[PDB]
Amino acid sequence: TVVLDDVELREAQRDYLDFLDDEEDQGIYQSKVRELISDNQYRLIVNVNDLRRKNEKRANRLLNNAFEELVAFQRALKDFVASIDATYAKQYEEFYVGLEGSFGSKHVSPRTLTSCFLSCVVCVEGIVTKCSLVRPKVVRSVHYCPATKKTIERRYSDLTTLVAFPSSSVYPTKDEENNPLETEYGLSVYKDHQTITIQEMPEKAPAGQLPRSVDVILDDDLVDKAKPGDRVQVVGTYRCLPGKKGGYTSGTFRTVLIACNVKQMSK
Amino acid sequence: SGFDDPGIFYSDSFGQARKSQLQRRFKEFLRQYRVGTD
Amino acid sequence: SHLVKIPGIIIAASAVRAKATRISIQCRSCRNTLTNIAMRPGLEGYALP
DNA sequence: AAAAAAAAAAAAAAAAAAAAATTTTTTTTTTTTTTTTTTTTTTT
DNA sequence: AAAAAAAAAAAAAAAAAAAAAAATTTTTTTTTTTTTTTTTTTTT
Ligand SMILES: [Zn+2]
């Protein structure tokens, strides 16, 4: 079911390819690309005020509906960093886009992270509370059959937020001939995964009231950027989670904030 | 560590006759039916 | 169900159709196989698991 | 002119295919409670 | 200044909520193959 073309995605990718194209301007984002290529870091931080001034409508669209918009942004980023250096752009299967700037209405606190801001990149200050063990998550798993001298690469899609199916979640262990498959851990590919919990600051929070906190899933690139007790500003995508399969549902949808970036709020 | 499931293994049998022994006696019938007179 | 010996004259002999003695079945979701089940010989059916 | 071969139409039977389908129990998690140790604080 | 008493902390154990986990063939339909019967067309 490969899509032949979509006007929305094509338009958005063109707009952000223009936004990254910085030579007629002062060269700020081109310089950012060049320095991050030199660093080997693979996230580029785009200021929302820059995006708003160059195209307010795209800023409204993105801050109202993130994930597919940022897929467009990141595909544009991959094309752009390939034009600067195809060899480096080939190196990483994805590159990422952090945010920064004046998230005017999109700056709330975990007390005020209502159910109006879903799939919207929200900005939120707060104190960490937990630091779960940063443990791997498998993304592309390679297997070897010694009976048949065979190799396979099962592929996994990061459906941390969408609907996920057992057919997607299968980890193969036997061939079609019921032979034994041995995992190739090194040849496989993994990304770190950590959960943390931001909290409304007690200096900011209401005086007499219980704390309120929000869960934050830091995948790779953001492993140890937040320990307990630290002040941190998290900007990212509040969303819903899928309940695991079962013929019943209550309406409950425990929600998270898949952080797009986190910075030291101490400033 | 829990990413695999290697198969069971077993060994050859060391030690109304059972169906395996009837199998053995059919094998004997085929292997030793001597028809040609001395 | 005991071996019997019978004379007769054949009158109609159907065409040789392929019947399965051992099979394999795949799972539609997990795509794992139950290789080489044994079909009980005769005009004996087989219910799938 | 009578016989018969062919045609279309109608019917029976065997093989394959079609369709129908929630409830009970277990386990993690959260939250408090209680014991006992440790720590701190007040007294002579 | 050190002893006694009290308060708080740390750690183990228990009770309920709510999300997960597991079990799970048989009867009806209907297409296709085969045969059968009445008729028309053709041949002796
Ligand atoms: Zn399966």
CSV table of C-alpha atoms (C1' of nucleotides) and ligand atoms in Angstrom, one decimal:
chain,number,residue,atom,x,y,z
A,1,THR,CA,0.0,0.0,0.0
A,2,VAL,CA,2.8,2.4,-1.0
A,3,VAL,CA,1.4,5.9,-1.5
A,4,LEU,CA,2.1,7.4,-5.0
A,5,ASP,CA,2.0,11.0,-3.9
A,6,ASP,CA,0.3,13.2,-1.2
A,7,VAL,CA,0.0,16.9,-1.7
A,8,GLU,CA,0.2,17.5,2.1
A,9,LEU,CA,3.5,15.6,2.6
A,10,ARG,CA,5.0,16.9,-0.7
A,11,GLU,CA,4.1,20.5,0.3
A,12,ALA,CA,5.5,20.2,3.8
A,13,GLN,CA,8.7,18.6,2.7
A,14,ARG,CA,9.2,21.3,0.1
A,15,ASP,CA,8.6,24.0,2.7
A,16,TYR,CA,11.1,22.6,5.2
A,17,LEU,CA,13.7,21.9,2.5
A,18,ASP,CA,13.5,25.6,1.8
A,19,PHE,CA,13.7,26.3,5.5
A,20,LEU,CA,16.9,24.3,5.8
A,21,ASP,CA,18.2,25.9,2.6
A,22,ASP,CA,20.2,28.7,4.2
A,23,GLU,CA,22.7,30.3,1.8
A,24,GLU,CA,20.8,33.4,0.6
A,25,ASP,CA,20.1,34.1,4.3
A,26,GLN,CA,23.0,34.3,6.7
A,27,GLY,CA,23.7,30.6,6.6
A,28,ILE,CA,22.5,29.7,10.1
A,29,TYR,CA,20.9,26.4,9.5
A,30,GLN,CA,23.5,25.4,6.9
A,31,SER,CA,26.1,26.1,9.5
A,32,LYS,CA,24.1,24.0,12.0
A,33,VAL,CA,24.1,21.1,9.6
A,34,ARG,CA,27.8,21.4,8.9
A,35,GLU,CA,28.7,21.5,12.6
A,36,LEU,CA,26.5,18.6,13.6
A,37,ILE,CA,28.0,16.6,10.7
A,38,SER,CA,31.4,17.5,12.2
A,39,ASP,CA,30.2,16.5,15.7
A,40,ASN,CA,28.5,13.2,14.6
A,41,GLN,CA,25.5,14.4,16.5
A,42,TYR,CA,22.3,13.6,14.5
A,43,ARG,CA,19.7,16.0,15.9
A,44,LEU,CA,19.2,19.6,14.6
A,45,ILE,CA,17.5,22.1,16.7
A,46,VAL,CA,15.1,24.4,14.8
A,47,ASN,CA,13.7,27.5,16.4
A,48,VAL,CA,9.9,27.7,16.3
A,49,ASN,CA,10.1,31.5,16.0
A,50,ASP,CA,12.2,31.1,12.9
A,51,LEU,CA,9.7,28.7,11.5
A,52,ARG,CA,6.8,31.0,12.4
A,53,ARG,CA,8.3,34.1,10.9
A,54,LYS,CA,9.3,32.3,7.6
A,55,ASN,CA,5.9,30.5,7.5
A,56,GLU,CA,3.4,31.0,10.3
A,57,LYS,CA,0.9,28.5,8.8
A,58,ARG,CA,3.4,25.7,8.9
A,59,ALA,CA,4.2,26.5,12.5
A,60,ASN,CA,0.5,26.4,13.4
A,61,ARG,CA,0.2,23.1,11.5
A,62,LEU,CA,3.2,21.5,13.1
A,63,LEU,CA,2.4,22.7,16.7
A,64,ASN,CA,-1.1,21.3,16.1
A,65,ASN,CA,-0.1,18.0,14.5
A,66,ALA,CA,3.5,16.9,15.1
A,67,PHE,CA,4.4,13.3,14.2
A,68,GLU,CA,3.7,13.2,10.4
A,69,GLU,CA,4.8,16.8,10.1
A,70,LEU,CA,8.1,16.0,11.7
A,71,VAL,CA,8.4,12.9,9.5
A,72,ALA,CA,8.3,15.3,6.7
A,73,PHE,CA,10.8,17.5,8.5
A,74,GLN,CA,13.2,14.6,9.1
A,75,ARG,CA,12.9,13.3,5.5
A,76,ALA,CA,13.8,16.8,4.4
A,77,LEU,CA,16.6,16.8,6.9
A,78,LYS,CA,17.9,13.5,5.5
A,79,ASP,CA,17.8,14.8,1.9
A,80,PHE,CA,19.5,18.1,2.9
A,81,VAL,CA,22.3,16.5,4.9
A,82,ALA,CA,22.7,14.1,2.0
A,83,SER,CA,23.2,17.0,-0.4
A,84,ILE,CA,25.8,18.4,2.0
A,85,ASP,CA,27.3,14.9,2.5
A,86,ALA,CA,25.6,11.8,1.0
A,87,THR,CA,28.2,9.6,2.7
A,88,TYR,CA,27.2,10.8,6.2
A,89,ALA,CA,23.5,10.9,5.5
A,90,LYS,CA,23.7,7.2,4.5
A,91,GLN,CA,25.3,6.5,7.9
A,92,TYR,CA,22.2,6.8,10.1
A,93,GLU,CA,18.9,5.3,9.1
A,94,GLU,CA,17.2,8.4,10.6
A,95,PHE,CA,18.1,11.9,11.6
A,96,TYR,CA,16.0,14.0,14.1
A,97,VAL,CA,14.7,17.5,14.7
A,98,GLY,CA,14.8,19.1,18.1
A,99,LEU,CA,12.8,22.3,18.8
A,100,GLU,CA,13.4,25.6,20.6
A,101,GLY,CA,11.8,29.0,20.9
A,102,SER,CA,8.7,30.8,22.1
A,103,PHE,CA,6.0,28.1,22.4
A,104,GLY,CA,3.5,30.8,23.4
A,105,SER,CA,0.3,29.0,24.0
A,106,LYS,CA,2.2,25.7,23.8
A,107,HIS,CA,4.0,26.5,27.1
A,108,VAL,CA,2.1,24.9,30.0
A,109,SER,CA,3.1,22.9,33.1
A,110,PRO,CA,2.1,19.3,34.0
A,111,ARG,CA,-0.7,20.6,36.1
A,112,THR,CA,-1.9,22.4,33.0
A,113,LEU,CA,-1.2,19.7,30.4
A,114,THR,CA,-4.9,19.2,29.6
A,115,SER,CA,-6.4,16.9,27.0
A,116,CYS,CA,-6.5,19.7,24.5
A,117,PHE,CA,-2.8,19.3,23.5
A,118,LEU,CA,-2.8,15.8,22.0
A,119,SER,CA,-0.4,15.2,19.1
A,120,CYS,CA,0.7,18.8,19.6
A,121,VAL,CA,4.3,19.6,20.5
A,122,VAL,CA,3.8,20.9,24.0
A,123,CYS,CA,6.5,22.8,26.0
A,124,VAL,CA,6.7,22.0,29.7
A,125,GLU,CA,9.1,22.9,32.5
A,126,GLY,CA,9.5,20.7,35.5
A,127,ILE,CA,11.6,18.6,37.9
A,128,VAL,CA,12.5,15.0,37.1
A,129,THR,CA,11.4,12.4,39.6
A,130,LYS,CA,12.6,9.1,38.3
A,131,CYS,CA,15.4,7.7,36.1
A,132,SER,CA,14.5,4.3,34.8
A,133,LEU,CA,17.4,2.1,33.7
A,134,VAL,CA,18.4,3.0,30.2
A,135,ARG,CA,17.9,-0.4,28.5
A,136,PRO,CA,18.1,-1.4,24.8
A,137,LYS,CA,15.1,-1.8,22.5
A,138,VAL,CA,15.5,-4.0,19.4
A,139,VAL,CA,14.8,-2.3,16.0
A,140,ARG,CA,16.3,-4.6,13.3
A,141,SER,CA,17.0,-8.1,14.5
A,142,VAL,CA,19.3,-10.5,12.5
A,143,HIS,CA,19.1,-14.3,12.7
A,144,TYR,CA,21.2,-17.2,11.5
A,145,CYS,CA,20.0,-20.7,10.7
A,146,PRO,CA,22.9,-23.1,10.9
A,147,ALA,CA,21.1,-26.1,9.4
A,148,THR,CA,20.4,-24.2,6.2
A,149,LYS,CA,23.3,-21.7,6.3
A,150,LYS,CA,20.7,-19.0,6.2
A,151,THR,CA,20.4,-15.4,7.4
A,152,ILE,CA,17.3,-13.3,8.0
A,153,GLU,CA,16.7,-9.7,9.2
A,154,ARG,CA,13.3,-9.3,10.9
A,155,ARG,CA,12.4,-5.6,10.9
A,156,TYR,CA,10.6,-3.7,13.6
A,157,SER,CA,8.7,-0.4,13.4
A,158,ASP,CA,8.8,2.0,16.4
A,159,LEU,CA,5.0,1.9,17.0
A,160,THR,CA,5.4,3.2,20.5
A,161,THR,CA,2.4,5.5,19.8
A,162,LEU,CA,0.4,4.0,17.0
A,163,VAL,CA,-1.4,0.6,16.8
A,164,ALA,CA,0.9,-2.4,17.0
A,165,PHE,CA,0.2,-5.9,15.7
A,166,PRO,CA,1.6,-9.3,16.8
A,167,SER,CA,2.7,-9.8,13.1
A,168,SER,CA,4.8,-6.7,13.6
A,169,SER,CA,6.0,-7.9,17.1
A,170,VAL,CA,7.1,-11.4,16.1
A,171,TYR,CA,10.7,-12.3,17.0
A,172,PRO,CA,11.6,-15.3,14.8
A,173,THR,CA,13.1,-18.4,16.3
A,174,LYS,CA,12.5,-21.2,13.7
A,175,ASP,CA,12.7,-21.4,9.9
A,176,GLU,CA,10.0,-22.8,7.6
A,177,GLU,CA,11.6,-26.2,8.1
A,178,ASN,CA,11.3,-25.9,12.0
A,179,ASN,CA,15.1,-25.6,12.2
A,180,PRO,CA,16.7,-23.7,15.1
A,181,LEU,CA,17.5,-20.0,14.5
A,182,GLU,CA,20.3,-18.3,16.5
A,183,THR,CA,20.0,-14.6,17.1
A,184,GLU,CA,22.9,-12.4,15.9
A,185,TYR,CA,22.9,-9.8,18.6
A,186,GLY,CA,25.8,-7.8,17.2
A,187,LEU,CA,24.5,-7.8,13.7
A,188,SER,CA,21.1,-6.7,15.1
A,189,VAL,CA,20.4,-3.0,15.8
A,190,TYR,CA,19.2,-1.5,19.0
A,191,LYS,CA,18.2,1.9,20.4
A,192,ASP,CA,18.4,2.9,24.0
A,193,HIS,CA,15.2,3.4,25.9
A,194,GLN,CA,14.5,5.2,29.2
A,195,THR,CA,11.4,6.4,31.0
A,196,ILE,CA,11.5,9.4,33.3
A,197,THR,CA,8.9,11.5,35.1
A,198,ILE,CA,8.7,15.3,35.0
A,199,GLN,CA,7.0,17.0,37.9
A,200,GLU,CA,5.6,20.5,38.5
A,201,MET,CA,8.2,22.5,40.4
A,202,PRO,CA,7.3,23.0,44.0
A,203,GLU,CA,8.5,26.6,43.7
A,204,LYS,CA,6.1,27.0,40.8
A,205,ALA,CA,3.4,24.6,41.9
A,206,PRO,CA,0.3,25.6,44.0
A,207,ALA,CA,1.2,25.8,47.6
A,208,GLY,CA,-1.3,23.4,49.2
A,209,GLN,CA,-1.8,20.9,46.4
A,210,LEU,CA,-0.5,17.4,45.6
A,211,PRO,CA,2.2,17.1,42.9
A,212,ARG,CA,1.3,16.4,39.3
A,213,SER,CA,3.7,14.7,37.0
A,214,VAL,CA,3.9,13.5,33.4
A,215,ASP,CA,5.7,10.4,31.9
A,216,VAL,CA,8.5,11.0,29.3
A,217,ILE,CA,9.9,8.3,27.1
A,218,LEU,CA,13.5,9.2,26.0
A,219,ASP,CA,14.6,7.0,23.2
A,220,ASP,CA,18.1,7.2,21.8
A,221,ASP,CA,20.0,10.5,21.6
A,222,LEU,CA,18.4,11.5,25.0
A,223,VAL,CA,19.6,8.8,27.3
A,224,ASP,CA,21.3,10.5,30.3
A,225,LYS,CA,20.1,14.1,29.7
A,226,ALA,CA,17.9,14.0,32.7
A,227,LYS,CA,18.5,12.6,36.2
A,228,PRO,CA,16.2,12.8,39.2
A,229,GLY,CA,16.0,16.2,40.9
A,230,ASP,CA,17.2,18.2,37.9
A,231,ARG,CA,15.3,21.1,36.5
A,232,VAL,CA,14.4,20.3,32.8
A,233,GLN,CA,12.4,21.8,30.1
A,234,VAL,CA,10.9,19.1,27.9
A,235,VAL,CA,9.4,19.9,24.5
A,236,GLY,CA,7.6,17.1,22.7
A,237,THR,CA,4.6,15.2,21.6
A,238,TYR,CA,1.9,14.5,24.2
A,239,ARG,CA,-0.1,11.5,22.8
A,240,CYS,CA,-2.1,8.4,23.8
A,241,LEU,CA,-0.9,4.8,24.2
A,242,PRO,CA,-2.5,1.6,23.0
A,243,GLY,CA,-4.0,-0.7,25.5
A,244,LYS,CA,-2.8,-4.2,24.8
A,245,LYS,CA,-5.2,-6.5,23.0
A,246,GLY,CA,-8.4,-7.7,24.6
A,247,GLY,CA,-12.0,-7.6,23.7
A,248,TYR,CA,-12.9,-5.0,26.3
A,249,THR,CA,-11.8,-1.4,26.8
A,250,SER,CA,-12.6,1.1,29.4
A,251,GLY,CA,-12.1,4.5,27.8
A,252,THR,CA,-8.9,5.1,29.8
A,253,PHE,CA,-5.9,6.0,27.7
A,254,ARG,CA,-2.8,6.5,29.9
A,255,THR,CA,-0.8,9.2,28.1
A,256,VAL,CA,2.8,10.1,27.8
A,257,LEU,CA,5.0,12.8,26.4
A,258,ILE,CA,7.4,11.5,23.8
A,259,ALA,CA,10.0,14.2,24.3
A,260,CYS,CA,11.3,15.9,21.2
A,261,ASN,CA,14.1,17.4,23.2
A,262,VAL,CA,14.9,18.1,26.8
A,263,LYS,CA,17.2,21.0,27.9
A,264,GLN,CA,18.6,22.1,31.3
A,265,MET,CA,16.0,24.5,32.7
A,266,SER,CA,18.6,25.8,35.2
A,267,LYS,CA,19.8,28.1,32.4
B,1,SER,CA,19.2,-14.6,26.7
B,2,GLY,CA,15.6,-15.5,26.2
B,3,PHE,CA,15.7,-14.7,22.5
B,4,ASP,CA,16.0,-18.3,21.4
B,5,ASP,CA,14.5,-21.8,21.8
B,6,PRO,CA,16.9,-24.5,20.7
B,7,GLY,CA,15.4,-27.9,20.1
B,8,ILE,CA,15.2,-30.9,22.2
B,9,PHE,CA,17.8,-33.6,21.7
B,10,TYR,CA,17.6,-37.4,22.5
B,11,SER,CA,19.8,-40.5,22.4
B,12,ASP,CA,19.6,-44.0,21.0
B,13,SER,CA,17.9,-46.6,23.3
B,14,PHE,CA,20.6,-48.2,25.3
B,15,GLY,CA,18.6,-50.7,27.4
B,16,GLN,CA,3.3,-59.3,23.9
B,17,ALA,CA,6.5,-58.0,22.5
B,18,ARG,CA,6.4,-54.3,21.9
B,19,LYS,CA,5.8,-52.8,18.4
B,20,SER,CA,9.5,-51.8,18.3
B,21,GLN,CA,10.4,-55.5,18.7
B,22,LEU,CA,7.9,-56.5,16.1
B,23,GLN,CA,9.6,-53.9,13.9
B,24,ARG,CA,12.9,-55.7,14.7
B,25,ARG,CA,11.5,-59.1,13.8
B,26,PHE,CA,10.1,-57.8,10.5
B,27,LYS,CA,13.6,-56.4,9.8
B,28,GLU,CA,14.9,-59.9,10.6
B,29,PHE,CA,12.4,-61.5,8.3
B,30,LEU,CA,13.6,-59.4,5.4
B,31,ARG,CA,17.2,-59.6,6.3
B,32,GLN,CA,17.4,-63.3,6.8
B,33,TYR,CA,14.7,-65.0,4.7
B,34,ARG,CA,16.9,-67.6,3.0
B,35,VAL,CA,15.1,-69.3,0.1
B,36,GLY,CA,17.8,-71.0,-1.9
B,37,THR,CA,18.4,-74.6,-0.7
B,38,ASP,CA,22.0,-75.5,0.2
C,1,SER,CA,-10.4,-54.5,10.0
C,2,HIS,CA,-8.8,-57.9,9.4
C,3,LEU,CA,-7.0,-58.7,6.2
C,4,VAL,CA,-9.4,-60.4,3.8
C,5,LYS,CA,-8.8,-62.0,0.4
C,6,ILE,CA,-11.5,-61.6,-2.3
C,7,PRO,CA,-12.0,-62.3,-6.0
C,8,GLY,CA,-13.9,-60.0,-8.4
C,9,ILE,CA,-14.1,-58.2,-11.7
C,10,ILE,CA,-13.3,-54.5,-11.8
C,11,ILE,CA,-15.8,-52.4,-13.7
C,12,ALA,CA,-14.8,-48.7,-13.0
C,13,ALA,CA,-11.4,-47.3,-12.2
C,14,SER,CA,-11.3,-43.5,-11.4
C,15,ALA,CA,-8.4,-41.3,-12.2
C,16,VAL,CA,-5.2,-41.1,-10.1
C,17,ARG,CA,-5.6,-38.1,-7.9
C,18,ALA,CA,-2.9,-36.8,-5.5
C,19,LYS,CA,-3.6,-37.5,-1.8
C,20,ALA,CA,-1.3,-36.3,0.9
C,21,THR,CA,0.5,-38.6,3.3
C,22,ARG,CA,2.4,-35.9,5.1
C,23,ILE,CA,1.6,-32.1,5.2
C,24,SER,CA,2.7,-28.8,6.7
C,25,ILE,CA,0.6,-25.8,7.8
C,26,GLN,CA,1.6,-22.2,8.4
C,27,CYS,CA,0.2,-19.8,11.0
C,28,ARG,CA,-1.4,-16.7,9.4
C,29,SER,CA,-0.1,-14.3,12.0
C,30,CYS,CA,3.2,-15.7,13.4
C,31,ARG,CA,4.2,-17.4,10.1
C,32,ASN,CA,5.6,-20.5,11.9
C,33,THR,CA,5.0,-24.0,10.5
C,34,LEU,CA,4.0,-27.4,11.7
C,35,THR,CA,6.2,-29.3,9.3
C,36,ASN,CA,5.6,-33.0,8.4
C,37,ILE,CA,2.5,-34.0,10.2
C,38,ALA,CA,1.5,-37.6,9.2
C,39,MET,CA,-1.8,-38.2,7.5
C,40,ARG,CA,-3.4,-41.4,8.6
C,41,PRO,CA,-3.6,-43.6,5.5
C,42,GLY,CA,-6.9,-44.7,3.9
C,43,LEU,CA,-9.9,-42.6,3.3
C,44,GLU,CA,-9.1,-40.9,6.6
C,45,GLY,CA,-9.5,-37.2,7.1
C,46,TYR,CA,-7.7,-34.8,9.3
C,47,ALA,CA,-9.0,-31.9,11.4
C,48,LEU,CA,-6.6,-28.9,11.5
C,49,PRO,CA,-5.4,-27.7,14.9
D,1,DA,C1',-41.9,-43.9,-43.1
D,2,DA,C1',-39.3,-45.7,-39.1
D,3,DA,C1',-35.2,-45.8,-36.6
D,4,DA,C1',-31.7,-43.6,-34.2
D,5,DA,C1',-28.3,-40.1,-33.0
D,6,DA,C1',-27.9,-35.7,-30.9
D,7,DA,C1',-29.4,-31.8,-28.3
D,8,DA,C1',-31.1,-29.4,-24.4
D,9,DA,C1',-33.0,-29.5,-20.1
D,10,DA,C1',-33.8,-31.3,-15.6
D,11,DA,C1',-32.4,-33.8,-11.3
D,12,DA,C1',-29.4,-36.4,-7.4
D,13,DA,C1',-25.6,-36.8,-5.0
D,14,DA,C1',-20.8,-36.2,-3.1
D,15,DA,C1',-17.1,-33.1,-2.2
D,16,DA,C1',-15.7,-29.0,-0.9
D,17,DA,C1',-16.6,-24.6,1.1
D,18,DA,C1',-19.1,-21.2,4.4
D,19,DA,C1',-20.3,-19.5,8.5
D,20,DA,C1',-20.9,-18.7,13.5
D,21,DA,C1',-18.5,-17.1,17.9
D,22,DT,C1',-17.4,-13.9,25.3
D,23,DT,C1',-16.4,-15.2,29.7
D,24,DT,C1',-13.8,-16.3,33.5
D,25,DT,C1',-9.5,-16.1,35.9
D,26,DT,C1',-4.7,-14.4,37.1
D,27,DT,C1',-1.1,-11.0,37.8
D,28,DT,C1',0.9,-6.8,38.0
D,29,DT,C1',0.6,-2.5,40.3
D,30,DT,C1',-0.4,0.8,43.7
D,31,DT,C1',-1.3,2.0,48.2
D,32,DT,C1',-1.4,1.6,52.9
D,33,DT,C1',-0.1,-0.5,57.3
D,34,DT,C1',3.1,-2.4,60.9
D,35,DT,C1',7.6,-3.7,62.9
D,36,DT,C1',11.9,-2.8,64.2
D,37,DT,C1',16.1,0.0,63.6
D,38,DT,C1',18.1,4.1,63.5
D,39,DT,C1',18.3,8.7,64.4
D,40,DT,C1',17.5,12.8,66.9
D,41,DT,C1',16.0,15.4,71.0
D,42,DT,C1',15.2,16.3,75.9
D,43,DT,C1',16.6,15.4,80.7
D,44,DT,C1',19.6,15.1,85.0
E,1,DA,C1',28.4,15.4,78.9
E,2,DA,C1',26.1,11.2,78.5
E,3,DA,C1',21.5,8.4,79.2
E,4,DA,C1',16.7,7.8,78.4
E,5,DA,C1',12.8,8.6,75.7
E,6,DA,C1',10.4,9.8,71.6
E,7,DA,C1',10.0,10.6,66.6
E,8,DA,C1',11.1,9.6,62.1
E,9,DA,C1',13.0,6.4,58.5
E,10,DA,C1',13.6,2.1,56.2
E,11,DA,C1',12.0,-2.1,54.9
E,12,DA,C1',9.0,-6.0,54.7
E,13,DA,C1',4.1,-7.7,54.2
E,14,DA,C1',-0.8,-7.4,52.9
E,15,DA,C1',-5.6,-5.9,50.3
E,16,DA,C1',-7.9,-4.1,46.5
E,17,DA,C1',-8.3,-2.1,41.2
E,18,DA,C1',-7.9,-2.6,37.0
E,19,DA,C1',-5.6,-4.2,33.0
E,20,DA,C1',-4.0,-8.9,30.8
E,21,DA,C1',-4.2,-13.6,29.7
E,22,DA,C1',-6.4,-18.1,27.9
E,23,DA,C1',-9.7,-21.3,25.9
E,24,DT,C1',-11.7,-22.6,21.4
E,25,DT,C1',-15.5,-27.4,16.4
E,26,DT,C1',-19.6,-28.4,14.2
E,27,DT,C1',-23.4,-27.9,11.1
E,28,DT,C1',-25.3,-26.0,6.7
E,29,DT,C1',-24.7,-24.5,1.8
E,30,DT,C1',-23.9,-25.0,-2.9
E,31,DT,C1',-21.0,-26.0,-6.9
E,32,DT,C1',-19.8,-29.5,-9.7
E,33,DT,C1',-20.1,-34.0,-11.6
E,34,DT,C1',-22.9,-37.4,-13.1
E,35,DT,C1',-27.0,-39.5,-14.9
E,36,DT,C1',-31.7,-39.4,-17.1
E,37,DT,C1',-35.8,-38.0,-20.2
E,38,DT,C1',-38.2,-35.7,-23.9
E,39,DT,C1',-37.8,-33.6,-27.9
E,40,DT,C1',-36.0,-32.3,-32.6
E,41,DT,C1',-33.1,-33.1,-36.4
E,42,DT,C1',-31.0,-36.3,-39.3
E,43,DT,C1',-30.2,-40.8,-41.5
E,44,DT,C1',-31.6,-45.5,-43.3
F,1,ZN,ZN,1.1,-18.1,15.2
